[PDB]
Paper text:
Protein stability can be fine‐tuned by modifying different structural features such as hydrogen‐bond networks, salt bridges, hydrophobic cores, or disulfide bridges. Among these, stabilization by salt bridges is a major challenge in protein design and engineering since their stabilizing effects show a high dependence on the structural environment in the protein, and therefore are difficult to predict and model. In this work, we explore the effects on structure and stability of an introduced salt bridge cluster in the context of three different de novo TIM barrels. The results show that despite the similarities in protein fold, the salt bridge clusters differently influence the structural and stability properties of the de novo TIM barrel variants depending on the structural background where they are introduced.
The salt bridge variants exhibit similar thermostability in comparison with their parental designs but important differences in the conformational stability at 25°C can be observed such as a highly stabilizing effect for two of the proteins but a destabilizing effect to the third. Analysis of the formed geometries of the salt bridge cluster in the crystal structures show either highly ordered salt bridge clusters or only single salt bridges. Rosetta modeling of the salt bridge clusters results in a good prediction of the tendency on stability changes but not the geometries observed in the three‐dimensional structures.
Numbering used by the authors: 1 to 184
The structure:
């Protein structure tokens, strides 16, 4: 998720010093509120190609300087690359499929690729292949801390934690995670 709850979360996280806050939502209304409220990255959820391109253009005309497009369909991500979306968020399931998806995106000139996976094995292979942002899907506070910490001493320079619970994201802020991804 709700607008007043997302604003409240963003405000609390910013008042705790979060320097990179992402707001994820399938509703254009929430994301426009987050931009106005100062959210750093707007994460456009998986939608149709026509609706994704229309939302990207208006977020950009409204002043979004960091737009992320999330999609499991590689067609959307390329069309968002071409439109100029800033972060391409790969939500793949198969390992060898992910590095395949990442490699074409990078050859096409994607300068900011994010890989999203609850499986730490995929995220490491993404770190190996040079993905720019590792998006950890959280579930347990001590499990996320473990994954964040291993990823960090593996050399991950940009770690994002995704959670719908303010508890996990504050722990990720406390632990030094780079991007806090407010789920809605
Ligand atoms: Cl995401």
């Amino acid at each position: 998720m709700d607008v007043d709850e997302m604003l409240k979360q963003v405000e609390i996280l910013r008042r705790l010093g979060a320097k990179r806050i992402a707001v994820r939502s399938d509703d254009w209304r929430i994301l426009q509120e987050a931009l106005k409220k100062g959210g750093d990255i707007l994460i456009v959820d998986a939608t149709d190609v026509d609706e994704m391109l229309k939302q990207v253009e208006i977020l950009r005309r409204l002043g979004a300087k960091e737009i992320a497009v999330r999609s499991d369909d590689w067609r959307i991500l390329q069309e968002a690359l071409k439109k100029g979306g800033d972060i391409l968020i790969v939500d793949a399931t198969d390992v060898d499929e992910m590095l395949k998806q990442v490699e074409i995106l990078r050859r096409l000139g994607a300068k900011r690729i994010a890989v999203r996976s609850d499986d730490w094995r995929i995220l490491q292979e993404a770190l190996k292949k040079g993905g720019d942002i590792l998006i950890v899907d959280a579930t347990d506070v001590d499990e996320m801390l473990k994954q964040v910490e291993i990823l960090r001493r593996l050399g991950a320079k940009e770690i994002a934690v995704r959670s719908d619970d303010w508890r996990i994201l504050q722990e990720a802020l406390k632990k030094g995670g780079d991007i806090l991804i407010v789920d809605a």
